Amino acid sequence: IYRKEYVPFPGHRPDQISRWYSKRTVEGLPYKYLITHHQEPSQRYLISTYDDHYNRHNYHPGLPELRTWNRHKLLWLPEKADFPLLGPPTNYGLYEQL
Amino acid sequence: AERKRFLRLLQDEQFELDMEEAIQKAEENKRLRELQLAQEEKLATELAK
Amino acid sequence: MREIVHLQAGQCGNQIGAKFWEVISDEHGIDPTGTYHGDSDLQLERINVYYNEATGGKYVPRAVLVDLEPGTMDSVRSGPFGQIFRPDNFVFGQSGAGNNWAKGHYTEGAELVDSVLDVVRKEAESCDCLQGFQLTHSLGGGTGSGMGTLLISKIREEYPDRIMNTFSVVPSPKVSDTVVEPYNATLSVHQLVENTDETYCIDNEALYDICFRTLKLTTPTYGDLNHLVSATMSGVTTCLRFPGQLNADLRKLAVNMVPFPRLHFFMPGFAPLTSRGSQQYRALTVPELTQQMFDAKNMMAACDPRHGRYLTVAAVFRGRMSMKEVDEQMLNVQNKNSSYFVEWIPNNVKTAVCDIPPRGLKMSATFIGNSTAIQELFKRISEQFTAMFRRKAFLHWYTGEGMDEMEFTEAESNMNDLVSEYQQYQD
Amino acid sequence: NLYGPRVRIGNWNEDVYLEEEIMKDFLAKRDKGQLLIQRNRRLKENLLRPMQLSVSEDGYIHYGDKVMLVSPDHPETEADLFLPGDLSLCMTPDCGLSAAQTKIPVGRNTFTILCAAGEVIGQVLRYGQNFRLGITGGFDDRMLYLSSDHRTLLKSSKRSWLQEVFLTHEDSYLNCWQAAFPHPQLRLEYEGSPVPANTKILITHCHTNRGLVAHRHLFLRTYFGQEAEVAAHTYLDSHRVEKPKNHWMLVT
Amino acid sequence: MRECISVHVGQAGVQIGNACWELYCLEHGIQPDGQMGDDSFNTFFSETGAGKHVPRAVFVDLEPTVIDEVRTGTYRQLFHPEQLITGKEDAANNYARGHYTIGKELIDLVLDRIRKLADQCTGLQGFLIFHSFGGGTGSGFTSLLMERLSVDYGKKSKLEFSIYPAPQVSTAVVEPYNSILTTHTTLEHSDCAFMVDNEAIYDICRRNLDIERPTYTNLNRLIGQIVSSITASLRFDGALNVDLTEFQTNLVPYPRIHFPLATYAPVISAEKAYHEQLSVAEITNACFEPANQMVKCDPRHGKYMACCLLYRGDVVPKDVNAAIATIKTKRTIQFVDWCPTGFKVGINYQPPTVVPGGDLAKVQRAVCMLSNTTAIAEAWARLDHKFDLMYAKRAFVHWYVGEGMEEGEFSEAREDMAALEKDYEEVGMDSV
Ligand SMILES: Nc1nc2c(ncn2[C@@H]2O[C@H](COP(=O)(O)OP(=O)(O)OP(=O)(O)O)[C@@H](O)[C@H]2O)c(=O)[nH]1
Ligand SMILES: Nc1nc2c(ncn2[C@@H]2O[C@H](COP(=O)(O)OP(=O)(O)O)[C@@H](O)[C@H]2O)c(=O)[nH]1
Ligand SMILES: [Mg+2]
């Protein structure tokens, strides 16, 4: 019965795929910004307060003088509502030097 | 060796799975539905006429 | 304006710092080939905080990466970030400790400490001005709790001046993973009290809530859960790395949080969480972030914070905001319920500001709390401890490599007198 | 308790949003072309370009002749790790240089014989005389060069730690090779004879006087899967003639 | 570099290691003639200059028919010419011959090749013994080796998978003596003694796999899969891997408690697997039903002490916490007061590779519990009971006195069992 059962098997290749897929079943490799990103996708959104208020001189495409008082919500928004985000971020010449 | 197996063929094979399943679904749907519906309706109307 | 030395150990910590040393790589625009391909000249400002330099303009971290098993060190540098970590900053043995504290703290995890001690002073003396020492590990085994909390007693022998901050993982209450947890949990709590200052307590029962009840997935796992902890880390030191309105740091945080030589056990949080369906249906503004960071369901420990009081509350903020709407909503939440604060301190909530959130968020916050319902995490260990010591179970792993019963029966008299302090001030 | 993907049971809605956003991001990546498939196929098609060699009007090699570098099969029994037969010299990037089991000209094989001290673009080559070996990557259109420096304490080969051989863009004297005869009592009679095409001739450097070798004993797993090691170290036997490791043939 | 030098003692040891090393050469690319990504086959498979991997374990039998049948089988070119050790005479169902004469004549080549393996290794964790309580070579040679190795290599992990004799049914007449004597001489030099039976696997191979009239060769692969999902943590990667020290430090509370029970959960055939739904909950509730133990004992007469859930395959790690949480809310599963944690989980992701054309199917989630229970003292009660009936007549004792060992071992081998069951009764009570 030993010589019965222990006939060799050429071609029972083990799989490599279910282990590799359970790895990302646990991990989830590109998933780690799909967990905490919010609102609308955006690559460059970020700028600082000294550079916006002082050196920048503030928002450009907005209303320069008009602050219009709206109907339903009781508010003078078109200055406050922008919260300026114009243009490129704070660049001042350090990537050049380094 | 672990970096070579787990970085350069892993992602290639997974993206090839998803590309091939999209192509298989599209080709199967268009070919089977167009051929079967067109041939059946046309020869049914010819026989009845 | 300092650098940060950050220690990692255990089978845990190199699967947590693997997510930590890649959010810092995300926020400074660090590609995994070593160089910098960010967009501004703001990110390049305080790159020194986390990234030493070499030739060619590449930045390699200050990473300390230690474990007895070579099981997980084959997995951290086989990630996407494998050429960003340092080659000679992997220190290991060959054997594995595995759930005992004798051969972590005295023999088998111990002969490699002189191979962690003489890698720190290679780098932590080459840093020009350090703020202190960080650590992340699990108390639940034998390489974090065996080597790191041994080394926490060792590196505080040299420098008492700096500040110890910790990212600890206490064992979960309900379903545990090892039969010998309330020894390794017991003995390292009595370790932690004398030599650590802001000790942060993290659980996995409290995080398998958040990826289920809050963010609404159906398969929460470790990689989904390691990143919310690794969101907290870069959300802590936001002002030593970026400008803002009111900058804070790890010495500003300790003054406004811990009053006492012994009342120094904490509890963390992280504010802006939602699902993937309601991504555009929410408005990420201040009346939404403040509404949930104080809630019990958005908390990373085994605390029902209503059952006790917060003696003190910290915070931080990020993002281009205004200050009046963060001046009154932490003034309303101190006012609307005086039941959940103690009366003898006049203020509780500290406010800190930055200018930039993590990449993808719009505005952010990170809740840090010294509540006295954190003593409901150290009552179940002392309930589990002496209901094991009474039958003297498993003690021949604990006499067999150099410890006594006198390292045992005094390792609960620290846990008793801790809770004997936190109950004085409960009402 | 738990069902499949599409049936409207349980927590399906948030997951429907989840694979909707992941499926759309994956389609955006495929449309832009930032996927590993199309980048890798474009790279490998620009490497494995089926291109044509130059036949020789006689037995001899001239300059400017697009000539493969190949090493013959050996019956040697020095060790029991072995690559089967006729290895060739191929650019293996990550660039690097190694030896692969191939025999067709495929564009990372194809070397142009160039002149270092010689002048004419067609000129007969002789033993003991300097020349250069040129190869070009796809769309770069700039001549690479076969190089190897005197050994230092930081510049060693990958698996073996001998003198290493690599490819570089620059021009120097650490790029010039010279080819001699293996039978050691006849090379001083062969110092000026023209070199026939497919004959077994040693290759040596001119600055180090070491020689290019093929290690059939240690393997380099690549993307292409074909394996060997190249270096430069002259080998001799107990009878002090050159081993079959060092024989090279420049086939057309 | 985390090898496991294993020992196979006796007719039982070689006949189970045939299927065990069948699975170890099956799951890799290992041909049955030495030849042949992952390099975790160097923990059981050495190299040479021809790629030829030769297994690092020792097979002993003094009764050389099984070893010569291996040497002439299909597995000749793979095993070493020397780590297969024969005699020309068997111990033949006695403790005296195996422990004093036939053990003493040939223990030295065993210890030689163990020292050669142990100094050609670099990273051995411990020693794993597969042996037989109820015979001659698997008991006397076993205890002689487990004295002669624990005197040399000292404190190291020792786990014993033991082919224990059956509760009611039997094969040889005088198994109580040769069980009791080797148990008394193993208890002082064990660390963890995993226990299996034969009719208790016949029952499951009838009632689960639906194959009727099976053999030893159809029983052997279930142990050959049990040992593989035991050792799987070194064998492949995972989320929470297991070294060899955590069984031995998580499973035994005391000096003389160490007798756990083994069980293996997802047992089903090919025609039924595709229509049953392999849920984590249904697997872990099958693994606690007393119709699914490898040892014929009923756990309802006593209390558990410590468990070890060792997973394999596509674990969903939230669902394991949910499964343990719904186990813990039952009164039909009882526990002692002093272990309030009472669990351990180990993880690996590789699915179980199953032999071609076997009695089992391609399961995707394997569970092994190696838990200890105080309802194995009931099993020890019967082999003290049989000894009490037999020694009073002084039956069979001349075979024992006529090869060197005295009759005065027979009183102490019962006093030892009485004190062991005293220990098992005093540990499982409540304190108030
Ligand atoms: N189920 C099962 N039982 C086995 C197997 N091999 C041996 N046994 C059991 O082993 C018990 C003792 O028989 P042996 O193994 O021949 O005895 P021994 O330990 O080798 O001692 P000696 O025969 O004197 O050399 C028998 O009751 C068998 O039931 C096996 O492969 N499967
Ligand atoms: N959420 C989460 N938990 C982890 C991670 N790694 C480890 N753990 C927990 O940490 C514990 C393992 O600690 P252990 O390996 O024994 O500690 P060590 O001996 O110091 O390495 C287990 O209970 C895990 O649940 C991780 O990456 N994420
Ligand atoms: Mg026998």
mmCIF file of N, CA, C and O in Angstrom, chain A residues 17 19-21 23-24 29-30, chain B residues 5-6 9-11 13-14 17:
data_model
loop_
_atom_site.group_PDB
_atom_site.id
_atom_site.type_symbol
_atom_site.label_atom_id
_atom_site.label_comp_id
_atom_site.label_asym_id
_atom_site.label_seq_id
_atom_site.Cartn_x
_atom_site.Cartn_y
_atom_site.Cartn_z
ATOM 1 N N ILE A 17 -0.805 32.696 -5.383
ATOM 2 C CA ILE A 17 -1.655 33.845 -5.628
ATOM 3 C C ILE A 17 -2.555 34.166 -4.437
ATOM 4 O O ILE A 17 -2.784 35.341 -4.140
ATOM 5 N N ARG A 19 -2.080 33.679 -1.182
ATOM 6 C CA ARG A 19 -1.288 34.336 -0.152
ATOM 7 C C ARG A 19 -1.040 35.807 -0.484
ATOM 8 O O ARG A 19 -1.243 36.697 0.361
ATOM 9 N N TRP A 20 -0.615 36.080 -1.724
ATOM 10 C CA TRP A 20 -0.357 37.440 -2.191
ATOM 11 C C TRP A 20 -1.613 38.292 -2.189
ATOM 12 O O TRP A 20 -1.517 39.516 -2.075
ATOM 13 N N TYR A 21 -2.783 37.675 -2.314
ATOM 14 C CA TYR A 21 -4.014 38.451 -2.313
ATOM 15 C C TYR A 21 -4.578 38.603 -0.910
ATOM 16 O O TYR A 21 -5.246 39.603 -0.625
ATOM 17 N N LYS A 23 -2.597 39.123 1.543
ATOM 18 C CA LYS A 23 -1.728 40.200 2.020
ATOM 19 C C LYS A 23 -2.403 41.562 1.892
ATOM 20 O O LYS A 23 -2.449 42.339 2.851
ATOM 21 N N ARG A 24 -2.983 41.844 0.727
ATOM 22 C CA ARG A 24 -3.696 43.099 0.507
ATOM 23 C C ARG A 24 -5.150 43.050 0.942
ATOM 24 O O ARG A 24 -5.770 44.108 1.076
ATOM 25 N N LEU A 29 -3.214 48.407 -0.075
ATOM 26 C CA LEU A 29 -2.061 49.288 -0.277
ATOM 27 C C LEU A 29 -2.413 50.699 -0.766
ATOM 28 O O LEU A 29 -1.986 51.664 -0.107
ATOM 29 N N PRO A 30 -3.163 50.920 -1.868
ATOM 30 C CA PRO A 30 -3.465 52.320 -2.226
ATOM 31 C C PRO A 30 -4.572 52.918 -1.382
ATOM 32 O O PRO A 30 -4.869 54.108 -1.524
ATOM 33 N N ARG B 5 9.854 40.368 -5.954
ATOM 34 C CA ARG B 5 8.585 39.682 -6.194
ATOM 35 C C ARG B 5 7.393 40.532 -5.774
ATOM 36 O O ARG B 5 6.359 40.523 -6.445
ATOM 37 N N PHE B 6 7.515 41.280 -4.679
ATOM 38 C CA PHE B 6 6.408 42.037 -4.121
ATOM 39 C C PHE B 6 6.351 43.477 -4.609
ATOM 40 O O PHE B 6 5.615 44.273 -4.024
ATOM 41 N N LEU B 9 6.162 42.570 -10.135
ATOM 42 C CA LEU B 9 5.261 41.660 -10.833
ATOM 43 C C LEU B 9 3.889 41.569 -10.184
ATOM 44 O O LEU B 9 2.913 41.258 -10.877
ATOM 45 N N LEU B 10 3.816 41.867 -8.881
ATOM 46 C CA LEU B 10 2.563 41.904 -8.125
ATOM 47 C C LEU B 10 1.551 42.843 -8.764
ATOM 48 O O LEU B 10 0.436 42.438 -9.137
ATOM 49 N N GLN B 11 1.958 44.101 -8.947
ATOM 50 C CA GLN B 11 1.051 45.128 -9.431
ATOM 51 C C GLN B 11 0.761 44.937 -10.909
ATOM 52 O O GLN B 11 -0.357 45.214 -11.367
ATOM 53 N N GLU B 13 0.543 42.001 -12.465
ATOM 54 C CA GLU B 13 -0.453 40.944 -12.589
ATOM 55 C C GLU B 13 -1.837 41.409 -12.157
ATOM 56 O O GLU B 13 -2.824 41.068 -12.814
ATOM 57 N N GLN B 14 -1.936 42.191 -11.068
ATOM 58 C CA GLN B 14 -3.261 42.635 -10.621
ATOM 59 C C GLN B 14 -3.920 43.593 -11.608
ATOM 60 O O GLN B 14 -5.128 43.471 -11.899
ATOM 61 N N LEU B 17 -5.180 41.574 -14.466
ATOM 62 C CA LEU B 17 -6.466 40.945 -14.152
ATOM 63 C C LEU B 17 -7.617 41.892 -14.416
ATOM 64 O O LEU B 17 -8.619 41.514 -15.035
#
